[PDB]
Structure formats: C-alpha cells, structure tokens
Design a binder for this molecule. Structure first.
Ligand code: HEM
Ligand code: HEM
Ligand code: HEM
Ligand code: HEM
Ligand code: HEM
Ligand code: HEM
Ligand code: HEM
Ligand code: HEM
Ligand code: HEM
Ligand code: HEM
Ligand code: HEM
Lengths: 142, 147, 145, 140, 140, 147, 142, 140, 142, 145, 140
C-alpha cells in the first residue's frame, strides 16, 4: 500500500539519500555494487555503458540517468496522473531490450537497501518503500 | 565565451536544488510548465516540435510529464557540475538524442535559455542571473553541439 | 514535568519538519485529512459537524481542516512558553465551549490522531514526548468539556 | 494576483523568516509593534486582548493567532479553492470589527518591515502581490 | 511626502544598510540583480555599461554611481530646496532614456528588497514615502 | 499520571546502566536479590508466586538466576526508553507473559516499585528518585495493563 | 577454552559493543542482517515476530529480547552456577520449535562478527569469543 | 557494617575520587594534609617517612602506600574473607605503633573531607559505614 | 595497459591506502576478509600462518609480509628492470605450494577493492589498477 | 570570471600535487614527455622544432621539456595574482614571438595537453577549472600568434 | 658534488620551503631582497625588469622565473644528463650579462638565508654542495 502518507515519507527520505551533486553518485554506487553482487548476470545488460567499470565516466553518466529517472518518479508519487505518463515513457526506454524480469525486484531491493544505508535503518519504513518502489517499477518493466 | 566558475556552479547547484528537490510537491510542474509557456510565447514555431506530447493541452498528464522530464534533464546535468568528466559524457548523450529530433536547432537553446532566464528569477528565493546564465550555457552548449 | 522543555523541543522540531508554510498546500491537506480520518474513526464524531461535511474534495472542509491544524500548530510551537501556551489553549477552550457537541473525549481523540499520523509520516517521532505534550494541549482545549 | 511562481517564493521566504517555536512569538510581537508604530490608531482596536502590555501572555497569544493565520494561508497559497474558502471565513470574522482600508495597508507595511529583517533574500514585488491577495480576501 | 521625522528614519537606516567601502559595491550589484529579477525588461537599458557581466568593473561602477546618487539625495532629504534642485538635475539626465513608470516602480521594489536584508529594523512605510519623493523628482 | 520526561529517561538510563552493565561482576545478583528480599519483606504473600524458582533458598543458582532474569527484563525495557515504539511492543509482550501467571496482580507491581525504590538509592552512586519513579511507572504500567 | 581471563575480556568488549539505549539496536541489526544474508532460511523462523521486516517495532523488540538474553548470559560468564541456570531456562524457550541445529553456529559467527565490527578488529581475541559464545549456545540449543 | 549495596556505592565513588597517576599522589598528600589539620598531634607519628616536607618523595611515597592500601581494601570490600584477612595483616603492622581511637577517627574525618571534594555525588552514610568496617579491622 | 602515467597514479594511491603503521593492517584486513569471503577454500592455503584467525599476531605478520611484498612491487612499477627481479624472487616463494591459479585474480580483485574502499571510488581508475596489478601477479604465479 | 580565484586555487593545488621538486626527475620527465606526445599528436607540430628533436632518450629534449613545463608551472602558481601572471605570460609571449613557427593554435594545443595529461595522472582533477585557467594562460602566451 | 643522498634531502627541503601559489612569490621577492642586502651592487643588474619597485608585477615575475628555474633544476638534480643540459642552457643565457663569481656567491648566500627560515629542518652542508653544483653549471 503506497498511501498518501507513505508517498510523502518516501519523497522526503529519497531526497535526503539522493542529495545534491556528487552525493548522488554515492547513492548510485551503493545501488549498482549491491545489484551486481547479487545478480552477476545483470552487469552484462550494461555493456554499452561500460558496466564492467562502474567508476568510469561513461557508466556514471548512465547511473545518474537512471537515478534521475527514479528521482523524477519519486518526486511525482503524489501526482499520479503525471507519474503514470512518466512511467509509460520510461517503459519505452526498456521494452524489448531483453531485460530479465528478475532484474527489477533486484533493483528495488538494491535501491531500498542503499537509501536505508544512507539515511539510517532505525525506524525505516520498509512497507512504504517497497510498496511505492513497486508501483514505480511495475510501470517500467514488461 | 563566458565561463561557469567554481563559485558560479556552487551557487547555481544550491539554489536550483532548493527549488527542484524531490522533497517538495507541485513545484516541478509549475516551474517546468512556466518554462514551456515562456518558450512558446517567445518562439511560436517552437511548439510544433512538441507535437508528440500534447503541447496544445498544457494541463494534460502527457504534457506535464513532458515538461517535467525535460527539466529534470537539466537537473541531472546541473548536479553533475562537480564532476565534469561525467557531465561531458552526459551532454554528448543528450546531444545525440536531440540530433535525432527533426527540427531542433542550436538557436532553440538560446530561446530555452531565455525561458529559464525569465522563469528562474520568479521562483528562486535567492537567484543570481549571471551565474545561472554562464552555467546554463556551459550545459546547453554541450547539448546543442552538432545542431 | 509533563511535556518538559526537552519533550516540547523535540515535538516542535518534528512537527515543523512535517508542517510548515514552504510545503505544498496539497501535502498539508493530505496530512490534515489523514488526521481527521483517524479522528473520525476513533471518536465516532459525525463529519456533518464540520463545514464541508468531512468531504476531502470540498474546499470548505479542507479550509476547516487547515484551521484546526493551524490551531494545533500555534499551540505546539508555543509549548516552550507555558504562560503563552496556556492562554492560547484558553482561547481555544472558550471557542469550543461555544460549539455544541465538542466533548473532552473527542478533543483527546483528535489530539491523539495528530500524534499518530505524525508518527506515520515521520516514523522516528519521539512518541512519548508527543503523547505527553498533546495530552497537555488536549487538557487545555477540552477543559470543562 | 500572486501567481504560481510568486507563491513559491513567498512560501519559502515566509517559512524561513517566521521560524519556529519562541522565535515565532518574538517575530509576531515585532509585527504588531511595527503595526502600532506605523499606525498609532490601530492599537486601541486590540484593547480586548491585553494590548496594554505587549509582552503579556494574552497579547502574545493574539499575535500568534494572527501570524499563525498568515502561516496557514501562505501554506495554502498554491491551493486556490482552499485558500479562498479560508479567506472568506476570516472576512466573516473581521466584518463586525469596524476596520478600514488603511488598517490593512498598515498591516501590509508592518509585514514588509519585519519579514525581510529575518532574511538574506526578500522579493518585495512578489510579497506585495501575495499580501494584497490575502488582505483583499479578508477585507471582503 | 516624506516628512521631517520620516527623513530621519530613512537617513539612519540607509546609512546603516548601505555601509562603507566594498560593502557598498556588493549592496549595489545586489540592488541591480534584484531590479533585473523583478523586471526582466530593464536589463537591456544598461547595455552601455557592461551589463552582460554584472561583476565587471564597468557595471559595478554604474551601480555605485546610482546608489551613490541615492546616497547623496538621502543625505539632503532634510534640505528641501537643495534636494529639489538635485532631483531636477537627475530628471534632466534621465529624460532621453525612454524610461516609464514601471521602471521606477521596479527600482522602488528592488530598494525595498535589498535595504531591509541588511538591517535589524526597517520601516517600510517611511521608505515608501521617501522613495516616492525621490522617484517622483527623477521621473519628472 | 506522572510523565517520564525526555530528561527523566536520559537520567534513569544512564544511572541504571552504570550499575547493571555486563562489564561489571557480582553487582547484578546483589542488586536483584535485594529487590526480591525487599519485595518479600513487604508482601509476605508475594513469595508464593515464585514457587517455581526456589524462592526459599535465595542463594541457590536457580533463585539467583530468576532474580537476574527478571531484573534484566527491566534493563531491557529501560534501555528502550529512547525508542518507545519498540518499548510498547515489548511491554505488550511482557504483559501477555504475566497475564499467563496465576495470581500476578497489578498491585504487585506497586510493591515491586517499592522494592526498587528502596534498593536503587542504596546502590546507585548518583540516583534521582522522582525520575526513577516516573520512568519505572511508565514501564510497569505497560506490563500490569490487563491484570 | 573460555578461561577466567577470557570471560573478563568478553564481558568488557560485549558491554562496549552492546552499549546503551538505541546503540543496542545497531548491534542487533548487524547480527540479523549478517545471519539472514548467510542463512536465508533462518528468516522464516521469525515469521511470528515479523522477520520479513527487521526494522519494524515488532522485530526490534524480538531482537532486543534476544540480545538481552545474550547480555544476561555474558554478564554471568564469571558466575557459572547462575549461568547454567540461565542457559537451562533459555533452552526451554527454544526446544521443539524446529530450529535447525545449524542456526546456532551461524548466530555465533554473526554475533562475534558484529562485536568485532563495533569494537575494532585489531587485537580482537577470536579464541576467547568463540569459546565463550560456544559455551553459551551449547546450553540453549538441543 | 557496610552491606553489599553500600560496598558498590563506595567502590564506585572511591575509584572516581582517587583517580589515576599523579592525581593519586595529590589526593594522597591532601588526605594527610587534612589529617594533620584535623589532628595536629598525628604529624609526629610520621617522623620516619620525611613528614617535615610533605612534598618530598619520601612522604609522598608513604601517602601513596596508605591510600594504595585503602584502594586494595575497597577493591575487596565485596569479598569478606579476603578483606578480613588483609585487614588482619594491616592490624598486625599497626599494632606496635602506639595509635589510639582518636587517630583512626581523625583519619576517617580526613577521608570524609577529601573524597567528596573530587565528586559530584557522595553518600556519607555509606562511607561512614564502610570506613568504620575498615578502621575497625585495622585498629584490631 | 599499465602505462607510465598509470604507474605513477597507482604508486600514489597505493601509498595512500597502505599508509603507515597500523593503517597497513586495516588495508590487509579488508583484503583477506574479502578474499576469504569470495574464495572460502583460499583460507586453508594459510593454515601454517593461522589463516583461521586473521586477527592473531601470527596471521597479521603474514598479512603484512604479503602487503610488504606488494608494496615493494608497486613502488618499483616505474623501474621495470628491478621489478622483474623482485617478481622472480617472489615467484620462488610461491611455486610448488599447490596454490590454485584462481587464487591470484581473486587476490587482485580483493586488493583493488580494498584500495578503492580506502581512497574513494569517485574517479577511481580501474583500468590502471587492474592492468598494473595483473603485471605484478603474472610474475608471481605459475 | 574566467579562471576565478576558486578555479585557480584548485588548479594550483592539483598541479603541485603532480609536479613539485620533491618528486623524482624521471617521474617529472615521464609526465612532461606524455604532455609533449599528446601535444605533437593534436597539433601536428614537428618535433624537429625542439632541441633534442622530441627524442625522449635525448637529454637535450628532456631538459627542453623541463623548461616548457616549468614555464607552465610558474604561470599556474601565479594564477591567484593576475597582475603578476599577466606579466609572466607577456614575457613568454615575447619569447615565442621570437621563435619561428609558434602559432596561437599550437599554444592552445600544448596547454590542453597539460590539462588532459594531468587528468590522466590525477582522475579527480577539476577539469572545467583546468580548461578555463589553461585557456587564460594560452591566450596570454599566444597573443598575436 | 651533490650526491644521490644529498639530492633527496635538498629536493625535499626546497619543495617544503618554496611552497605553492603566492607563497612562492613572497619567497622569491625575499630571496632578491636578501641578495640586494648582501650585495648592494647586484641590484642595478636588474634595471631591465622593474627593480625600482620590487613589489611590481614586472619584478615579481622576474623573481619567479629565477626561483622557478631553481625549482626545475632541483626537480632534476637526480637526473645528471638532464640537469647538465639544462644548466648549459642557462649558462648560455647568462654569458653576456657580465656577471662574476661574487654575484653567484651572493645568490648562494641569499638562498642559504631565505630557505631555512621556512623550515624546521635544514642541512646547510647538503645545500652548500648542491647549490655549488647548480651555480657552477650556470657560471660556466
Ligand atoms: C526505477 C527503476 C529504473 C529507472 C527509473 C530507470 C531509468 C533509466 C533511464 C532514464 C535510462 C537512460 C535511457 C537513455 O536516455 O538512453 C535507462 C537505461 C537503461 N536501463 Fe533502466 N531504469 C530503471 C531500472 C532498470 C533495471 C532494473 C534494469 C536492468 C536490470 C535497467 C536497465 C537499463 C538498460 C539496459 C539501459 C540502457 C543502457 C544503455 O544506455 O545502453 N533499468 N534506465
Ligand atoms: C538544456 C536544455 C534541455 C535539456 C536538458 C533537454 C533534455 C530533454 C530530455 C531529457 C527529453 C525527454 C526525452 C529523453 O529521455 O530524451 C527531451 C526531449 C525533447 N527535447 Fe529537449 N532538452 C533541452 C532543450 C531543448 C530545446 C532547446 C528544444 C527545442 C525547442 C528541445 C527539443 C526536444 C524535443 C522535440 C523533445 C522530444 C519531445 C517528445 O518526447 O516527443 N529540447 N529533452
Ligand atoms: C486538538 C484538538 C483541536 C484543535 C487544535 C482545534 C482547533 C480549532 C480551531 C483553531 C478552529 C477554528 C476557529 C476559527 O474559526 O477561527 C476550530 C473550529 C472548529 N472545531 Fe476545533 N479543534 C480541536 C478539536 C475539535 C473537536 C474534537 C471537535 C469536534 C467534536 C471540534 C469541532 C470544531 C468545529 C465544528 C469547528 C468549526 C467552528 C465554525 O467554523 O463554526 N474541534 N477548532
Ligand atoms: C491581513 C491579515 C490578517 C489576518 C490573517 C488576521 C487574523 C486574525 C485572527 C486569526 C484573529 C483571531 C480570531 C479569534 O480566534 O477570535 C484576528 C482577530 C482580530 N483582528 Fe485580525 N487579521 C488580519 C488583519 C487585521 C487588521 C489589518 C486589523 C486591524 C488593524 C485586525 C484586527 C483584529 C481585531 C481587532 C481582532 C479581534 C481581537 C479581539 O479578540 O479582541 N486584523 N485576526
Ligand atoms: C530612482 C533612482 C535613480 C537614481 C538616483 C539614478 C541615478 C543615475 C545616475 C547617477 C546615473 C549616472 C549618470 C552618468 O554619470 O552618466 C544614471 C544613469 C542611468 N540610469 Fe538612472 N537612476 C535612477 C533610476 C533609474 C531607473 C528606474 C532606470 C531604469 C530602469 C534608470 C536607468 C538609467 C540608465 C539606462 C542610465 C544610463 C546608463 C548608461 O550610461 O548607459 N535609472 N542613473
Ligand atoms: C517491571 C517489573 C517486572 C519485569 C520487567 C518483569 C519481567 C519478568 C521476566 C523477564 C521474567 C522471566 C521469565 C520470562 O522470560 O518471561 C519474569 C517472570 C515472572 N514474573 Fe515478572 N517482571 C516484573 C514484575 C513482576 C511482579 C510485580 C510480579 C509479581 C509479584 C511478577 C511475577 C513473575 C512471576 C511469578 C514470574 C515467573 C517465575 C518463574 O520463572 O517461575 N513479575 N518476569
Ligand atoms: C545466545 C543466543 C540466543 C539467545 C540468548 C536467545 C534468546 C531468546 C529470547 C530471550 C527470546 C524471547 C523469548 C520470549 O520472551 O518469548 C528468544 C526467542 C526466539 N529465538 Fe532465540 N536466542 C538465541 C539464539 C537463537 C537462534 C540462533 C535462533 C534461530 C536460528 C533463535 C530463534 C528464536 C525464535 C524462533 C524465537 C521465538 C520468536 C517469537 O517470539 O516468535 N534464537 N530467543
Ligand atoms: C585506616 C586506614 C589505614 C590504612 C589502610 C593504613 C595503611 C598503612 C600502610 C599500608 C602502611 C605502610 C606499611 C609499610 O609498608 O611499612 C602504614 C604505615 C603507618 N601507618 Fe597506617 N594506615 C591506616 C591508618 C593509620 C592511622 C589512623 C595512623 C595514625 C594517625 C597510621 C599510622 C601509621 C604509621 C605511623 C605508619 C608507619 C610509618 C613509618 O614507616 O614510619 N595509620 N599504614
Ligand atoms: C601480489 C601478490 C602477492 C605478494 C606480493 C605475495 C607475497 C608473499 C610474501 C612476501 C610471503 C612471505 C614469504 C616468507 O617470507 O615466508 C608470502 C607467503 C605466502 N603467500 Fe603470497 N603473495 C601474493 C599473493 C598470494 C596469493 C594470491 C596467494 C594464495 C591464494 C598467496 C599465498 C601465500 C602462501 C600460501 C604463503 C605462505 C604462508 C606461510 O608462510 O606458510 N600469496 N607471499
Ligand atoms: C603552454 C604553452 C607553452 C609554454 C608554457 C611554453 C614555455 C616555454 C619556456 C618556459 C621556454 C624556455 C625559454 C628559455 O629558454 O628560458 C620555451 C621554449 C621554447 N618553446 Fe615554448 N611554451 C609553450 C608552447 C610552445 C609551443 C606551442 C611551441 C611550438 C609550436 C613552443 C616552442 C618552443 C621552442 C621551440 C622553444 C625553444 C627555444 C630555444 O631554446 O631556442 N612552445 N617555451
Ligand atoms: C644561480 C642561480 C640562477 C638561476 C637559476 C637564474 C635564472 C635566471 C632565469 C630563468 C632568468 C630569466 C631568463 C629569461 O627568461 O629572459 C634569468 C635572468 C637574469 N639573471 Fe639569472 N639566474 C641565476 C643566477 C644569477 C645571478 C647570480 C645573477 C646576478 C647577481 C643573475 C642575473 C640575471 C640577470 C641580470 C638576468 C636578466 C634580467 C633581465 O631580463 O633584464 N642571475 N636568470
């Protein structure tokens, strides 16, 4: 249940974790390092953006494009009509790329884990994060 | 050309993020819609390039998302100003995307610059036009390269 | 003491982190409406008692919600100055003595709805401090009711 | 009056200026001190809320209800229908008070005097627009 | 407009706000930054004094001549005949510039935006009166 | 009721931990045995409820462990005073455990309170009775709820 | 060999790592995150205390009950007669719950790892920790 | 005398008061300075350990052996059989010194004078009980 | 490609990560903990230096001998003639010990990961590190 | 401004971290030779123009490389004092006006070779600040060329 | 002269002493101030680089080229063939200047005067050896 209160909490904590400037790369690195560690085959999906070297300028630009799109969706969590249109466009950037369905719940788990690591686990609301993140990826995959 | 100095980008990044942060609600759409309203007001022909996003019904979910998507693109670039090696890869990316859109010309970025220059002063509590102009050009010139 | 300076300080900081003027009116209404939903459920009070009848789509009800929340906002921000806070609470008491149907129990239910919704949007809330300070506010507003 | 962009500037600057906790009380008493200094005749209008001692609990409470109302109105500046209804409610409360245009003008000037002294950046144009939006709604 | 008592309040607050030395230059550039932010169309009017780079020596110099003039006018606010003659001189200098009422209104709002951010006490009523006294004299 | 303030719990948690810490030896048994000796001295009938722990041979390993187990239960709760959401779940847990013990009554917690109030002043270098009393009640009242 | 000197060292370092107030949750989280990562099936053993969300108030209370019992045993390491009685009671709270034997050495490894992470690995005495922790769990399991 | 709970209070307060390193030496010289100030006749009893200069190495060493003994006794206050044996040893060492009740009373008062001045919390009742427990054992 | 510029970068960052005194143990621990986690069987290769307890004085001396040899090779990266002789001698200390070939790329990945963790991932040059580290281990193994 | 105090400060710190006298002469030559290799490739300038003919084994060329790099070193370290830096650049300008074959474009290529090699040996380099400050230095050295 | 070990000591101490940024300019002007103070006749030799005002941009620039050259030579002290070629280049540049032994001796003494005042450790023997190595190469 990504409730109206849940959405505001997620927006607040996401902005805190994502941050400004290079702090966004700190969050991105936590996400990709975790994802690639858990799902080794996922790295190959990024061969065109140098997924073999996540510290390269090429992969970092990719990483920030991805977190930028997640940021854009999170920011619009309390504006569903616009969010649905954003998700629809993001879906066009992923369909027919052969991305394994499993990659999405894995990315969700890595993103949530990275935010939690950044803002602190005490009192962290996993139901709000999982339910809202799921609403976002469910519009992107398939 | 002008130069987007270390001080310029620090100022621009801070003030921009204070307005665009995902923490707030309803500010992104208002700001992005105002930028596009200004753009179309300045260059009547410009709207034509945005036929695929329902530009004639500004309050549609589709147009609003378009405005927000484009402007978040600027957010992404502005926040890469403290890691230009990455910004350069990103601008190249953005450049190739625009080169692939029939009609998009370099002159359009000047009108877009104009639109942001008109809108930012109205919504950013603390705003410095010269720093903005110089850092926006550093970014825009990277995207419009090629067109 | 009940709602000590320490309790008051953390409650004010957390409240102002959730409710402040820089936030979007739609977000403040979402949190206010959530508080009223929890209040209506725990108190059994009829929504018809309020202007706009509890309809979250009614601009009269959202403005009514804004006023009630603002009353709590002013009392909360004045918790570190008891003389001033007591006066604010006294004015609110008089106003509710003049409204038919307002009971001390109901006032308590609404004050607890405020604490519980704050904890939902800010899970790191100092909930015992919230309970004690909202109990103080509720006692003042509902005095004699 | 008071467009979508100006609303954001005003909401941000008010929140920063007004502050939290006791700073709100000092700010509020200052607002009324300036109101009385700008328009001496307005003071007697507050004889019912202990205005003889502006540091009293009674008068401070009144000042906080007023700035507290400004706070809730600015919080809803971006929700037209909601703020319009709240302004109508306030107009109803001020209707019998025998106030006039100069009283609201003096309050406006008091706001323009106090708010910026607690800020590094202040846009008086946006504030003139949005204060008018508010006063207009209350004067009726 | 701008009576003997208001003149004293304004002279005192301007002197404190405007400061000395380089603080005057920062204050002055800020004034014009706010002017341009409030009225975008006014910027082009300054194409002749290096406005493309507001930190340039040329533009800073222009800003200082302007606030420097405000300074000398406020210094003489309490000498009617003297300031009237100086305002007539300035009106003569602005006559061919093709300026309008909104330009002076925007400058007024820029002054009301910058001055108080460098003060603990600001009386916007006295300032509205005395700024009008000055602008009025220059607009002609 | 009284209120266990932010200041009250900070004081209680610090002083309690200074006595109960696992770093020290022989203090837990002495303190816990003294609490039970006081309890039994105040309520003769109370001992009956502790037939399953050899209450009649206080120095047995079994009784000592009982005293230590019960009092560490208070240690666990006192240290949750800076995360009441968790303390509330714990008190509910403790409540259900006691509701399941024939004879345990709410009044017994008042005598237990009395026992701790008698013992703490004697062993805690720095001790504040009012803060202790208020924070102990905040905890005890959560456990005795139901009985 | 959990010697008399080993016991005093363990008591000292445990108290340092466990700490006071919310710091106990920091240690608990390190332990459960490690345990569940290494032995995924272990999480299900805690379904009744919401093991799926270790940050929930329900799981945190469970976590602190567990660390409270470990604390109680560690504190009594130098008082064997009382310790044996404490272990005997703890055993009654675990027998016939279908807890896999493997869960205990896994928990020992996670607890030790968490304490080491908290107090510092340099000069860390793993023999003392393993031998004393083993004496404690060997009275709880089976 | 000196029960299990009082022992804990005293052990904790002594450890904090007495401190470490050179602070122990200053504390110890202070203890004897107070002893001599409280009972002037006791000073001559220490003629054999350089008491003429209380800052001398010889006298400081004596003071440290004494507070060092208090330290080891308090460390064992919670081990009855052990401390009883150690107190008997000390009684044997003081037996030929020709001391009397007033000497131990003066030492007790010196301890009650110095210890609390290095503490935020001091329980004089527990200390009177435990000091008596100790003095009693040494006086024989 | 371990280029002349790459060599200078690696020397600089290695010295920063390895550091002085006990900070060298911090780097060593990051390396062995990672290596043993990824390649469990590798621990047994160190039974003679108490690989079962990496915190023991015995294993720490071993660890520092290993990092000392790596330090010596890195320091000589810009002096190839001498480096080749150093690698040749190191090879004599490893041949015919039954060390699995896989152990080396694993150690390289752990060392690089530890240095990156120590000096910061932003702008980290993985090509320089991998290529120069590979030139070093390729002279030691086989 | 172009090459602000902030840009200058970070550029000087990074440069001095790469080039300073405590470093081995062989390392300074390796980095200098790398800059010349990138310069020769982007500018098309003939190595025969320099003493030692661009042969990295020639002690005359390495000393020539040391001089060019030192010229950049002195200009870079003087970036926070524009009057002094302008004077240094003016002297360099005169010297190059006297060398046949030095073009403004070439000067720019060498200055960019400096920035790009620094970024290779120090990947965390503030490359926009480098570009702007080296552009300032290049404009002064190549003035009229 | 100036062996492999001395080269390391000198390179390290020069880098620390000389510093970075504007500190280099102050250091360099100080070096020449000392040169002129030690040998008054040397000043006129610099009439072509604005020596009349040692704080001028022109003279500071000259001082920096000189210490900058010392810097590049010391950077290559450990590469014999390279520094020998660079010293020959410099000798060629000083050949027509009509300098003598005392000028280089005075410069040496100026270096020995300024460098250590910016250090906690200075080895004058190693510096005498390596400065001679350098001066020798330039005097020709
Ligand atoms: C909320 C989650 C996600 C968001 C918002 C997101 C967003 C994006 C964006 C904005 C781009 C850049 C497109 C462009 O401009 O060319 C992108 C590219 C890509 N994404 Fe996602 N993404 C998400 C999750 C995932 C997941 C889970 C995977 C795979 C396991 C994935 C795989 C890719 C791939 C393969 C590319 C193309 C890389 C390339 O440019 O070659 N994405 N994504
Ligand atoms: C610095 C300013 C700009 C930035 C950061 C930017 C970025 C973007 C982004 C991120 C999108 C969304 C689609 C995608 O993922 O690629 C987009 C689409 C587009 N942009 Fe831009 N843009 C900028 C300025 C301009 C200008 C000056 C024009 C021309 C008037 C233009 C023309 C378009 C068009 C025609 C589309 C496609 C609309 C569609 O989705 O059908 N952009 N831009
Ligand atoms: C925490 C507790 C409460 C606070 C802070 C609070 C505060 C307020 C405030 C500030 C107003 C607006 C007064 C004005 O018009 O200026 C108000 C109005 C009102 N309140 Fe409350 N209130 C509380 C509890 C309750 C409860 C429990 C009830 C119902 C049982 C209630 C019923 C009303 C009604 C019906 C009005 C509208 C009066 C009207 O507009 O005619 N309030 N309250
Ligand atoms: C434009 C901004 C204003 C706002 C938001 C505002 C707000 C309020 C509020 C919230 C109350 C308290 C109502 C209650 O709970 O009884 C109040 C009372 C009052 N207001 Fe205003 N007000 C404004 C303007 C003015 C002006 C311009 C004046 C006169 C100079 C004025 C005169 C009064 C008086 C006399 C009372 C009644 C005091 C009493 O109870 O004796 N207000 N106002
Ligand atoms: C009300 C306060 C004002 C004062 C005291 C003032 C003062 C001055 C002064 C002293 C100069 C310099 C004259 C010279 O030495 O050449 C000047 C120039 C000028 N002023 Fe004003 N001014 C005022 C209002 C305005 C306004 C409202 C505008 C337009 C928005 C304006 C536009 C100009 C322009 C365009 C110039 C000529 C710049 C040039 O040389 O290119 N002034 N003013
Ligand atoms: C706030 C104070 C108290 C705390 C924290 C507490 C907690 C505990 C704990 C942790 C145990 C050990 C067994 C288990 O794991 O559940 C226990 C057992 C028990 N408690 Fe309490 N308790 C408190 C007060 C009382 C009072 C007031 C009584 C009645 C006089 C009581 C009656 C019992 C009995 C009868 C047992 C079972 C003894 C056995 O093991 O056979 N408790 N308590
Ligand atoms: C030294 C190690 C351990 C100690 C001291 C300990 C202690 C405890 C304590 C005190 C409780 C709370 C009982 C209650 O009051 O209801 C508990 C519950 C429990 N423990 Fe342990 N435990 C340890 C290790 C383990 C391990 C290794 C596992 C499984 C892999 C485990 C599984 C459980 C389960 C399943 C519960 C019940 C959860 C529930 O309430 O539903 N424990 N333990
Ligand atoms: C009640 C606490 C006391 C303790 C723990 C204590 C302890 C000691 C110790 C450890 C020594 C040193 C023995 C040696 O190594 O030779 C000593 C010596 C001595 N004590 Fe005490 N003592 C106490 C009370 C007193 C009192 C009350 C007096 C007299 C006012 C006293 C008079 C002496 C004298 C005269 C010596 C021998 C000094 C010498 O060697 O010349 N003591 N005591
Ligand atoms: C760049 C990488 C490495 C360097 C520089 C290095 C260096 C060394 C050095 C200097 C010693 C100490 C020899 C002595 O004095 O007795 C040693 C021992 C040893 N090394 Fe390596 N080593 C490296 C990688 C590895 C790897 C990857 C493995 C296995 C997976 C390994 C396994 C061993 C073993 C088994 C010993 C003997 C331990 C003993 O003393 O019993 N080494 N190494
Ligand atoms: C960033 C740009 C440059 C800097 C900082 C620089 C600096 C220098 C310096 C300091 C010297 C030594 C002067 C002396 O003998 O004392 C020099 C010499 C020389 N430079 Fe440049 N230079 C630059 C660009 C260029 C370019 C682009 C060329 C070629 C197209 C060039 C060609 C030469 C030649 C041939 C000499 C040797 C003159 C001789 O020894 O006869 N320089 N330069
Ligand atoms: C031993 C260390 C010395 C070094 C490294 C050195 C370095 C230099 C350098 C790099 C230049 C600038 C060349 C140019 O770009 O035109 C120069 C110029 C000059 N040097 Fe030296 N020098 C040294 C010794 C001396 C001494 C001992 C004197 C005389 C007391 C001297 C007198 C001059 C003069 C007169 C000029 C020419 C100034 C002009 O252009 O008018 N130098 N030197």
């Amino acid at each position: 249940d990504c409730t109206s209160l849940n959405r505001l909490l997620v927006k607040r904590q996401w902005a805190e974790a994502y941050g400004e400037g290079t702090n966004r790369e700190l969050l991105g690195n936590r996400i990709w390092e975790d994802l690639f560690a858990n799902m080794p085959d996922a790295r190959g999906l990024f061969s065109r953006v140098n997924g073999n070297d996540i510290d390269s300028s090429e992969f970092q630009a990719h990483s920030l494009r991805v977190l930028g799109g997640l940021d854009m969706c999170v920011a619009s969590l309390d504006d569903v009509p616009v969010l649905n249109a954003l998700l629809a466009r993001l879906n066009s950037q992923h369909d027919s790329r052969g991305i394994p369905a499993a990659g999405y719940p894995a990315f969700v788990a890595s993103a949530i884990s990275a935010v939690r690591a950044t803002v602190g686990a005490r009192s962290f609301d996993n139901d709000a994060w999982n339910s809202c993140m799921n609403q976002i990826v469910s519009g992107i995959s398939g | 050309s002008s130069c987007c100095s270390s001080e310029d980008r620090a100022n621009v990044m801070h003030n921009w993020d204070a307005a665009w942060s995902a923490a707030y609600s309803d500010r992104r759409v208002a700001l992005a819609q105002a930028v596009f309203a200004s753009l179309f007001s300045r260059d009547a022909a410009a709207q034509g390039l945005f036929s695929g996003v329902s530009a004639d019904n500004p309050d549609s979910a589709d147009f609003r998302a378009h405005c927000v998507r484009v402007v978040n693109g600027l957010d992404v670039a502005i926040n890469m100003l403290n890691d230009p090696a990455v910004l350069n890869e990103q601008l190249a990316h953005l450049s190739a995307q625009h080169q692939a859109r029939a009609g998009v010309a370099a002159a359009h970025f000047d009108v877009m610059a104009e639109a942001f220059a008109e809108v930012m002063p109205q919504v950013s509590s603390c705003f410095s036009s010269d720093s903005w102009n110089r850092c926006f050009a550093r970014i825009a010139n990277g995207i419009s390269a090629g067109l | 003491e009940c709602c000590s300076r320490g309790d008051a300080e953390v409650v004010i900081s957390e409240w102002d982190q959730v409710f402040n003027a820089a936030m979007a009116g739609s977000s403040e209404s979402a949190i206010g409406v959530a508080i009223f939903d929890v209040f209506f459920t725990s108190s059994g009070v009829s929504p018809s008692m309020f202007p706009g009848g509890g309809d979250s789509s009614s601009a009269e009800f959202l403005a009514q919600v804004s006023r009630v929340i603002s009353g709590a906002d002013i009392a909360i921000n004045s918790l570190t100055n008891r003389a001033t806070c007591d006066s604010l609470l006294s004015h609110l008491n008089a106003q509710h003595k003049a409204i038919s149907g307002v009971t001390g129990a109901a006032v308590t239910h609404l004050s607890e709805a405020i604490s519980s919704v704050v904890a939902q949007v800010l899970p790191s809330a100092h909930i015992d401090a919230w309970g004690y300070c909202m109990a103080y506010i509720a006692a003042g507003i509902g005095a004699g009711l | 009056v008071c467009n979508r962009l100006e609303q954001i500037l005003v909401k941000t600057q008010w929140a920063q200026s007004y502050g939290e906790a006791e700073n709100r009380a000092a700010f509020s008493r200052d607002l009324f001190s300036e109101l009385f200094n700008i328009q001496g005749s307005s003071r007697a209008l507050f004889s019912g809320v202990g205005v003889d001692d502006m540091n009293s609990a009674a008068f401070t409470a009144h000042c906080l209800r007023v700035t507290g109302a400004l706070n809730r109105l600015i919080s809803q500046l971006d929700q037209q229908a909601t703020i319009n209804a709240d302004l109508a409610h306030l107009a109803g409360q001020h209707a019998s008070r025998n106030l006039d245009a100069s009283n609201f003008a003096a309050m406006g000037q008091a706001v323009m005097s106090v708010v910026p002294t607690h800020l590094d950046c202040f846009n008086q144009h946006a504030w003139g627009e949005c204060y008018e939006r508010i006063a207009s709604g209350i004067s009726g």
